[PDB]
Amino acid sequence: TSVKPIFSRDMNEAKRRVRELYRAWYREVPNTVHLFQLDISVKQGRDKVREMFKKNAHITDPRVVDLLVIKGKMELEETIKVWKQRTHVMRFFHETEAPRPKDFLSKFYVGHDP
């Protein structure tokens, strides 16, 4: 498709990029974990980062892989600074929300027709 790409060209400089800002996240999880005075096992903070970057795996295209970045490149602005107050962060790890069954026969006794 003819439209100018954003940053990358095909898939390599692109997949050099996603490798890159990983470390900015990987090098800085914990400085926050003492800064907000939020308490968690610092390794959790390194599981989620690696839990997300493995999530969107099937992407076939440039200008998508550049699009996601422009989001991801942002967040390091807010989080590495303090523009969030504890409660824009911890929302990643959902503490309160009761589990979903996701199995079959556990559904059939609770809830209609999902």
Partner 1 sequence: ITVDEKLDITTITGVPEEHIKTRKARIFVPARNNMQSGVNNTKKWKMEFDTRERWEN
Partner 2 sequence: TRPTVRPRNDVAHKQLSAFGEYVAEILPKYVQQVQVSCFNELEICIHPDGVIPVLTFLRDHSNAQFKSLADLTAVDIPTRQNRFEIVYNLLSLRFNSRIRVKTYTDELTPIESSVPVYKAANWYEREIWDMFGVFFANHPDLRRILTDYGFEGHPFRKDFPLSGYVELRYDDEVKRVVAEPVELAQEFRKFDLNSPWEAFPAYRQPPE
Binding positions for partner 1, 68-107, rule CB under 8 A? 68
- Is residue 6 within the footprint of partner 2 (CB under 8 A)? yes
- Is residue 4 within the footprint of partner 1 (CB under 8 A)? yes
- Is residue 107 within the footprint of partner 2 (CB under 8 A)? no
Could you say which of 63, 72, 80, 107 contacts partner 2 (CB under 8 A)?
63
Binding positions for partner 1, 14-73, rule CB under 8 A? 56, 58-61, 64, 68
Could you say which of 77, 103, 110, 113 contacts partner 2 (CB under 8 A)?
77
- Is residue 68 within the footprint of partner 2 (CB under 8 A)? no
Rounded-to-integer distance, Cα 88 and Cα 76, Å: 13
Per-residue DSSP letter, 91? G
Torsion angle defined by CA atoms of residues 81, 56, 114 and 94, in that order, rounded to the nearest 10 degrees = -30
Contact 6, 67 (CB under 8 A): yes
Q: Helix %, strand %, coil % for the chain, to 5? A: 45, 0, 55
Quick one: tokens of 49?
Answer: 């980062």
- Is residue 114 within the footprint of partner 1 (CB under 8 A)? yes
